[PDB]
Design a protein around this ligand. Sequence first.
Ligand SMILES: [Ca+2]
Length: 184
Amino acid sequence: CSMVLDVAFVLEGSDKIGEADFNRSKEFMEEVIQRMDVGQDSIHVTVLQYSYMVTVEYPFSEAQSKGDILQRVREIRYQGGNRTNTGLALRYLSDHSFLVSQGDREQAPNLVYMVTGNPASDEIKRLPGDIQVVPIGVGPNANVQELERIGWPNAPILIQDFETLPREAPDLVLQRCSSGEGLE
Ligand SMILES: [Ca+2]
């Protein structure tokens, strides 16, 4: 995927995810960022981790070089929160992450890859259409219909488990990134 795109990665870092699976989410995300043409004139990356609260791990406003992002990604500490505050994470995207004041490029399309393995603990609202969310529902505990609603028009990328996530999802994520749509 090589394009002007403001990509958000939203990783659930809840206790229900656990550090191991979150590290797999990180590794998936790293792989995606690695595959993506991340650069100042191309793909911009914001990284959010959420559980109880949302951490902007990397805002769009910070240096948009693959190296800087990937290194901050490696530095992302699993928060292990007791909630899956997906709605809050989504609100961060709409009301923070994708604000021009936070480094969002107004003319760049907005794409969110939200890795979640659990139902939202909180109220979820489908984001304004200008923020495209591709929910990555990982594991059997993903609330798929919730993800479908959050995701619309994007079909959730359903991954059987977090072990498979870094293996299978990057391809799907980058396909989605490049084409603007999910497969079939
Ligand atoms: Ca944008």
